[PDB]
Structure formats: structure tokens, C-alpha cells
Symmetry: C3
Subunit: 41 residues, 3 copies
């Protein structure tokens, strides 16, 4: 049953990673749009 | 069931892996485009 | 047996953490340099 705490801990840390990835994705897609609007500029 | 939770974890980890691969290739493209614009900027100066 | 899967997941999660860290750091620099290019084109 100690195993249950390690699964729980993995679930929580993974959620923080998922949230961090979502944040990066939006920042990156924004950078790409700005860059594509500097290429054409 | 613990096996169901570990399975659900493995699925979420695979999807994270896909996303990271894609974001990494996308970042590489972004840096290329950035370097190009910087080189254009310095040349224009 | 399920502990071997859990251990393997912990080792994978940390490698993914490290990947994201490289991505985040390089993106931070790119944005800094992006702003600079925008600002030296708004003044121009
Ligand atoms: K970020």
C-alpha cells in the first residue's frame, strides 16, 4: 500500500508538468506568430 | 485498481512525450527564423 | 511487479522534466531576443 503514495505523487507531479507544457505551448505558438509576422515584415 | 492507475499514468506520460517531441521540433524552427531576422536586422543597419 | 512499472514511470517523468527545462530555457532567450527585434523596428 506504500505503492499507492508513489502513484499519487506521480499523478500530482505529472499534472504540474502538463500545466507547464500547456503554458510553453501557448508562449511558443505566440512567438511563432510574431516571428512569422517579422518575416513578412 | 492500482494497475488501472499506473496504466492511466503510462498513457498520460506517452502523450507528454509526443507533445515534447513536437514542441522541441517547433522550437528549433522558431530559433532558425529568429536567427534569420536578427541577421537581416544587422545587415540592414 | 507493479513496483517495477512505478519505478520506470518515475525515471521517465524526470527525463521529461529535463527535456521541458531545456525547451523552457531556450524559449526564454528567444522571447528576449524577439522583443529586442520588435523594439528596434518600432523605433525604426
Ligand atoms: K514558458
Amino acid at each position: 500500500m506504500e505503492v499507492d503514495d508513489r502513484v499519487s505523487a506521480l499523478e500530482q507531479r505529472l499534472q504540474l508538468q502538463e500545466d507547464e507544457l500547456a503554458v510553453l505551448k501557448a508562449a511558443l505558438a505566440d512567438a511563432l506568430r510574431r516571428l512569422r509576422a517579422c518575416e513578412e515584415q
